[PDB]
Amino acid sequence: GLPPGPLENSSAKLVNDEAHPWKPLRPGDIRGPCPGLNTLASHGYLPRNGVATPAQIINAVQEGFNFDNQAAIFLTYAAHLVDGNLITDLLSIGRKTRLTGPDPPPPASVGGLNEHGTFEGDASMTRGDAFFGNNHDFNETLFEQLVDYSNRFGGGKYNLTVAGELRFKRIQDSIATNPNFSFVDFRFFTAYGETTFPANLFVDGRRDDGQLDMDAARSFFQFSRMPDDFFRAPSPRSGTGVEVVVQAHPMQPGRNVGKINSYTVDPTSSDFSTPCLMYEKFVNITVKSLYPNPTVQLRKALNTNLDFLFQGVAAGCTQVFPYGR
Ligand code: HEM
Ligand SMILES: *[C@@H]1O[C@H](CO)[C@@H](O)[C@H](O)[C@H]1NC(C)=O
Numbered sequence: 001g002l003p004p005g006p007l008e009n010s011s012a013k014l015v016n017d018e019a020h021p022w023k024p025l026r027p028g029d030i031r032g033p034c035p036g037l038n039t040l041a042s043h044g045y046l047p048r049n050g051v052a053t054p055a056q057i058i059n060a061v062q063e064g065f066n067f068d069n070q071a072a073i074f075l076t077y078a079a080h081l082v083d084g085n086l087i088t089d090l091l092s093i094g095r096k097t098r099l100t101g102p103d104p105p106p107p108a109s110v111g112g113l114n115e116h117g118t119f120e121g122d123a124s125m126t127r128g129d130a131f132f133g134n135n136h137d138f139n140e141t142l143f144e145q146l147v148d149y150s151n152r153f154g155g156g157k158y159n160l161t162v163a164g165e166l167r168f169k170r171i172q173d174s175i176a177t178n179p180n181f182s183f184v185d186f187r188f189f190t191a192y193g194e195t196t197f198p199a200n201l202f203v204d205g206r207r208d209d210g211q212l213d214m215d216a217a218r219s220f221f222q223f224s225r226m227p228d229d230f231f232r233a234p235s236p237r238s239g240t241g242v243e244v245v246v247q248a249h250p251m252q253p254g255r256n257v258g259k260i261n262s263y264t265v266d267p268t269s270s271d272f273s274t275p276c277l278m279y280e281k282f283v284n285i286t287v288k289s290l291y292p293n294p295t296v297q298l299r300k301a302l303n304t305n306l307d308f309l310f311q312g313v314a315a316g317c318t319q320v321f322p323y324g325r
């Protein structure tokens, strides 16, 4: 279906309402590495089993959290292209599931958001690196470090100052402990953006002060649960303030080279100075590597989702066509 348009009415409102009650997981219900999508599924803004169309996801993040249209479109079609079923139009917000329907040929994985190294990546705040055995479950130890960083840099609250320090700490942790640590291209970009989302979107919209309390933080991060009487943000936003997180500890993109403490800058990687290159590499390398020689119906689905992806890309970039026009 078409990418949904922006909200007609973007006002703060109760989103923990009678039609969107929190419910616990039933057997087969899928939750993954994204606390935003997890919460929308656990409140029935998405299907509660955690399998959704891109249009459902875009409508969910806008209606539930006032995620802005451009950011919703970019992230959703990126995730769908590398992790979703392009024929069925279904994406798992977590583990690989037969519920996304018959699989395309390898090397395409359709592994859901749990798929390491497509969208999901290292130095997550409350999820472990894939190397340590679990890239998707809430980690209490990592959350306790989030609380500690909030206590130290945020006076008990998670804010952009806390985001800047924790983002850097998680990178340094992965460099020290994950011999396979990768922090390039798409992950480099999204890892910074993600640290702003709690401050911008998990803060009750009646306050919108960028100060996330730890009761609200645990409710979202661990239980996929909006606070009682949660109001969504009062205006559309996504990553506003990412500049403060970067400026706190500017990092070059790079990877460990098969050993801990071997972080090596990748001059082939995009960085914040080459945003269009991040888009071009995502399409020409990541998507193309998953679908090198697509059949006619997969090629059509790819080109449609790649057009949709480009709608989410900031003006100034040229669209690239790996399967022609
Ligand atoms: C619009 C479509 C969205 C997609 C496709 C998406 C996808 C993802 C994925 C795959 C991750 C895991 C990346 C990683 O840490 O390895 C992630 C992380 C995250 N997402 Fe989402 N997301 C979306 C929207 C949102 C929204 C609306 C929010 C908040 C309201 C949000 C909050 C977060 C946060 C806080 C994390 C970081 C978790 C952590 O590092 O502990 N996302 N997102
Ligand atoms: C927008 O939504 C808010 C919150 O529900 C509501 O109070 C307001 O009346 C709505 N505005 C319009 C123009 O309907």
Ligand SMILES: *[C@@H]1O[C@H](CO)[C@@H](O)[C@H](O)[C@H]1NC(C)=O
Pocket (backbone or CB within 6 Å): 128, 139, 140, 141, 142
């Ligand atoms: C959570 O993260 C900590 C530190 O990274 C790690 O020791 C632990 O194994 C992870 N998983 C669980 C199951 O607590």
Ligand SMILES: *[C@@H]1O[C@H](CO)[C@@H](O)[C@H](O)[C@H]1NC(C)=O
Pocket (backbone or CB within 6 Å): 153, 154, 155, 159, 160, 161, 162, 210
């Ligand atoms: C985070 O909170 C601390 C302590 O209240 C404060 O010094 C800092 O300015 C805050 N940062 C932001 C961006 O609100």
Ligand SMILES: *[C@@H]1O[C@H](CO)[C@@H](O)[C@H](O)[C@H]1NC(C)=O
Pocket (backbone or CB within 6 Å): 277, 280, 281, 284, 320, 321, 322
């Ligand atoms: C992507 O491929 C297009 C079309 O061939 C080309 O113009 C562009 O330079 C490529 N970009 C990258 C980053 O390889």
Ligand SMILES: CCCCCC
Pocket (backbone or CB within 6 Å): 070, 071, 072, 074, 075, 275, 276, 278, 279, 312, 313, 314, 317
């Ligand atoms: C929606 C984010 C756009 C960034 C890519 C240039």
Ligand SMILES: CCCCCC
Pocket (backbone or CB within 6 Å): 071, 075, 189, 190, 193, 238, 239
């Ligand atoms: C959601 C804002 C853009 C993050 C990736 C460039």
Ligand SMILES: [Cl-]
Pocket (backbone or CB within 6 Å): 006, 007, 067, 068, 069, 070, 236
């Ligand atoms: Cl918007």
Ligand SMILES: [Mg+2]
Pocket (backbone or CB within 6 Å): 033, 120, 121, 122, 123, 124, 127, 128, 129, 135
């Ligand atoms: Mg991760």
